[PDB]
């Protein structure tokens, strides 16, 4: 099976935007937020979800159950396998840092509650351990760089 999943995932994850959007879908499903097109646009840091050619890809159709253009996951045992094995840890930590910076950067104006709870939910250790399982160096690097991305975190005991 793993070989089948790898072959059918390499047919979509080779593009940069497709990889970012797929990672955004997996990340928001991991946190538990609703999979809304406008919010997945902010998490994915592009607007490829609005194109009509995203939902007709091999990887997107073969890994996610699509229905009337919407995207939802198949099961947790495939999403967590994708997160652990198909996405490298070194990609995951860097993309997490990028989206954490960008959310704040565009949230300093709009003041949306969903972005705020997204940011304070990414900082929790349970999600990070569910995203980077038993990786000491990457977890340490992420925790030591999040305080330098945004300077208000030092005053927060959370």
Return contacts of 134-141, CB within 8 angstroms, 24+ apart: 135/89, 138/89, 138/90, 138/92, 138/93, 141/93
In this chain, which stretch among 4-12, 64-72, 93-101, 120-128 interacts with another protein, using CB under 8 A? 64-72
129: Cα separation from own chain's centroid: 14
* Segment interacting with another protein (CB under 8 A) among 44-52, 86-94, 103-111, 139-147: 44-52
Nearest Cα to Cα of residue 131 among 99, 104, 91, 101: 91
114, 92, 8, 74: CA torsion to nearest 10: -40
With CB under 8 A as the contact rule, the residue among 68, 75, 77, 155 that binds another protein is 68
* Interface pick for another protein out of 1, 3, 4, 67 (rule CB under 8 A): 67
Total residues contacting another protein (rule CB under 8 A)? 13
Determine, following the binding rule CB under 8 A, whether residue 109 of this chain makes contact with another protein: no
For another protein, the closer of residues 51 and 85 by Cβ is 51
CB of 55 to another protein, least distance (A): 9
Contact 59, 53 (CB under 8 A): no
Q: Which of 32, 53, 109, 158 binds another protein (CB under 8 A)?
A: 53
114 annotated among ligand-binding-site residues = no
Report the greatest alpha carbon distance in the chain.
Answer: 48
> Are 59 and 22 spatial neighbours (Cβ–Cβ below 8 Å)?
yes
- Given the rule CB under 8 A, which residues bind another protein? 37-38, 47, 50-53, 56, 65, 67-70
Going by the annotation, the residues of the binding site for ATP are 4
């Amino acid at each position: 099976i793993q070989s089948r999943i790898r072959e059918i995932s390499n047919l979509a994850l080779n593009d940069k935007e497709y990889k970012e959007t797929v990672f955004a879908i997996l990340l928001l499903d991991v946190i538990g937020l609703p999979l809304v097109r406008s919010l997945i646009s902010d998490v994915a840091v592009n607007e490829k979800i609005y194109s009509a050619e995203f939902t007709e890809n091999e990887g997107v159709k073969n890994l996610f159950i699509i229905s009337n253009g919407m995207v939802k996951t198949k099961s947790s045992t495939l999403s967590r396998f994708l997160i652990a094995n198909i996405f490298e840890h070194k990609y995951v930590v860097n993309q997490l840092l990028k989206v954490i910076e960008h959310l704040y950067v565009i949230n300093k104006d709009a003041k949306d509650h969903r972005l705020q709870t997204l940011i304070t939910s990414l900082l929790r250790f349970s999600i990070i351990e569910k995203l980077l399982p038993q990786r000491r160096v990457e977890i340490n690097y992420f925790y030591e760089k999040v305080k330098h991305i945004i300077p208000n975190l030092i005053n927060d005991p959370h």
